[PDB]
Design a protein around this ligand. Structure first.
Ligand SMILES: NS(=O)(=O)c1ccc(NS(=O)(=O)CCNC(=O)Nc2ccc(F)cc2)cc1
Ligand SMILES: [Zn+2]
Length: 257
């Protein structure tokens, strides 16, 4: 099916998922001179103290760490959000070179990678129902630039060689996602979509202003992963990012002036 290649990449997705040309697709370029400070936005509440990570998985388009969302353990609230959203998983998008890899861009600037912490609105009962609602998910997006190592990322980096190929998974319990956050929770927000198929328009995007720094050795280990499954031709998992989509009738708001 779909992927990031010449013949199955983002320019092809609309044939199976016509919402790819919809009115609130993600990612988008964040024009910092057009985003408006919104004083009515409240601070984000990231309550990850009780997070219970479960497994880490190569799904053939990225790697993800999953969490127990059967109860309010790791939740996102506040900011633009109404009610409570449970953390389900996080994954990344990254490039073949340090000058590309993020999905969102800031004044057309591309970061080396982008972290997505995926949360779903508990009023819809389960994530499958939430995906069918315009306010069903909230994804917290964090940019990665190459510089100093990120100590809270190293334990993810350490296990990637055990999930090199599509379909492999590993135990990944007792991981603390707070170690992936920057200092500031200043953010931009806009209504958008999943950035991979089915591209459902169900996401409140919350993109942090402050990137985290990761070392060249850490991002190099992202780039050793494979899109392919074991025993089939090796295609390095790089450049698994969708480019910026038309903003159309949308306003990006900033929590900071
Ligand atoms: N790149 S991004 O925008 O951050 C992003 C974030 C998440 C996704 N995909 S997801 O699978 O996790 C969507 C939510 N999970 C489910 O819906 N599962 C499900 C359960 C029961 C059903 F009956 C049907 C489906 C894609 C892109
Ligand atoms: Zn993503």
């Amino acid at each position: 099916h779909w992927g990031y290649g010449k013949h199955n990449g983002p320019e092809h997705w609309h044939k199976d998922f016509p919402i790819a040309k919809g009115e609130r697709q993600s990612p988008v370029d964040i024009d910092t001179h057009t985003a408006k400070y919104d004083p009515s936005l409240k601070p984000l509440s990231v309550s990850y103290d009780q997070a219970t990570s479960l497994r880490i998985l190569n799904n053939g388009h990225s790697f993800q760490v999953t969490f127990d969302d059967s109860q309010d353990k790791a939740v996102l609230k506040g900011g633009p959000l109404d009610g409570t959203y449970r953390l389900l998983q996080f994954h990344f998008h990254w490039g073949s070179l340090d000058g590309q890899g993020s999905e969102h861009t800031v004044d057309k600037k591309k970061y080396a990678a982008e972290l997505h912490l995926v949360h779903w609105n508990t009023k819809y009962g389960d994530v499958g129902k939430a995906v069918q609602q315009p306010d069903g998910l909230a994804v917290l997006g964090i940019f990665l630039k190459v510089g100093s190592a990120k100590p809270g990322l190293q334990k993810v980096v350490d296990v990637l060689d055990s999930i090199k190929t599509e379909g492999k998974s590993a135990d990944f319990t007792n991981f603390d996602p707070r170690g992936l956050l920057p200092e500031s929770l200043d953010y931009w927000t806009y209504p958008g979509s999943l950035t991979t198929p089915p591209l459902a328009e169900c996401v409140t995007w919350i993109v942090l202003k402050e990137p985290i720094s990761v070392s060249s050795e850490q991002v190099l280990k992202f780039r050793k992963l494979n899109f392919n499954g074991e025993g089939e031709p090796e295609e390095l998992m790089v450049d698994n990012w969708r480019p910026a989509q038309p903003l159309k009738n949308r306003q990006i708001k900033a929590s900071f002036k």
